[model samples]
Target: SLVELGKMILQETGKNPVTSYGAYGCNCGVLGRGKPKDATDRCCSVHKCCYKKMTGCNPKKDRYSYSWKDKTIVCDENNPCLKELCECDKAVAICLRENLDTYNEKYKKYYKKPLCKKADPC
Candidate 1:
């Protein structure tokens, strides 16, 4: 699941699924957060994958289904990677669209009223 994988990713990288600071910009990777550009579906803020990117589908190149065959994540190259849940046509969005809540304990803790400021960077 995205939640479990997110948790593991957090522990291994010490970086949340969404980066909050820096010039590289925060790759929030949240679903439905992007705007289309040049018919390529590029992101508005991060210049990443824009929603228009999901206009088409390619099973072999897109992350349409869960297959452990290659453990590879495909990207639209010109736009954001196809939304994981987009197989149902959710829209041009990131995986965060479908599973922000499943991201990690940190996300839950921080989002639910922010009981601890420690979660937020000073």
Candidate 2:
């Protein structure tokens, strides 16, 4: 509802963005980075949204560290925008746990992974 992730799911996007990455992986990584790091990349969808959607958070000027990096807690909780990012990255790091496999699979003949289908992601 409310066009969260384009209404692809019944659950509207909420405080936890990791769940948006269903089954815990982003096959978009295959279409992305040189290596297949779906889980790591899946975590990004929310991190990306966190940057542009919130006030005082600038994607170009902010520091969004790796989900598991030690710096995740640097942002002062007083700054809601900065803290929101910390939560976003932390969510990714947590999703990282759901995945035991370092990567997901893609068929050689079939490249139609649903994550890879939409040329434009909102």
Candidate 3:
């Protein structure tokens, strides 16, 4: 699993994901804009730059699965691009898990009240 693999890569590296990944704020699509809603969302900002820096695969051509199962079984394991894609995606997810603080006073106002319920990592 890319998520699992990414977590391993993150632990192995030991470098701070936030320090290595700069924030660009939370954005959704074409001409995206907005400040990061929370620390977790900040990772998305970095992913924008991550894929730009990533090589191996194109998100548009290589991604479009209805579910992770589609991505897992259909996409070739040898596809280096998706491997990097998963790594990048998981990088943020694992980072979010590391940074998640349900009671942080500073983040109280910043967190999305109900939280974002989505399969993709914040």
Candidate 4:
């Protein structure tokens, strides 16, 4: 009986109900809100629009934008222009709220809400 029980335990341990169990995992249907550099990167698309709404200025599309360094299209908090856009707090708030909602239920916990990290002037 003990031998049979051990065999059953071993069989159960070998089988995984979920196919995507690994170090990297899977995100086949998990929708990305914004542009991510690679398929695995997750970003919020609403962040750019919210930034524009708050500052009434478009984020630069050139090499200068700090978001580019991360392979994303977002307004960096470090931009000098942001310092003048004192009322832009609402943009960051909106980005967080909207982007968090975009994740599929199963994947939501894996990703953190977006943020405009405070940084030194550009």
lDDT score for residue 13 of model 3: 36
lDDT of each: 0.30, 0.39, 0.44, 0.29
Over 1-122, each residue of candidate 1 has an lDDT whose tens digit, in order, gives 23333433344334553451111112223422222221211211322333233455442244432222243333223433344323222221233333333344333222322222221111
Clashes by residue pair, model 3: 56-81, 57-81
Cα deviation in Å at residue 77, candidate 2? Answer: 2.8
**How much is 30 displaced in model 3, in angstroms?**
7.4
Q: How do the residues 1-122 of candidate 2 rate in per-residue lDDT, one tens digit apiece?
A: 11222221212222233233433333322233222335445444544554455677653356543222253323345667656655654544445434425534342222444444332252
Q: Which residue pairs in model 2 clash with each other?
A: 26-38
- Give RMSD to native, each candidate: 12.8, 11.8, 11.1, 19.8
| lDDT for 13 (candidate 1) | 36
Q: Which candidate is the best by lDDT?
A: 3
Ranking by lDDT: 3, 2, 1, 4
Off by over 4 Å in 1: 1-15, 19-47, 56-64, 69-71, 74-122
lDDT of 4 by residue, 2-49 (tens): 222122222323322122111111221233233332222222233223
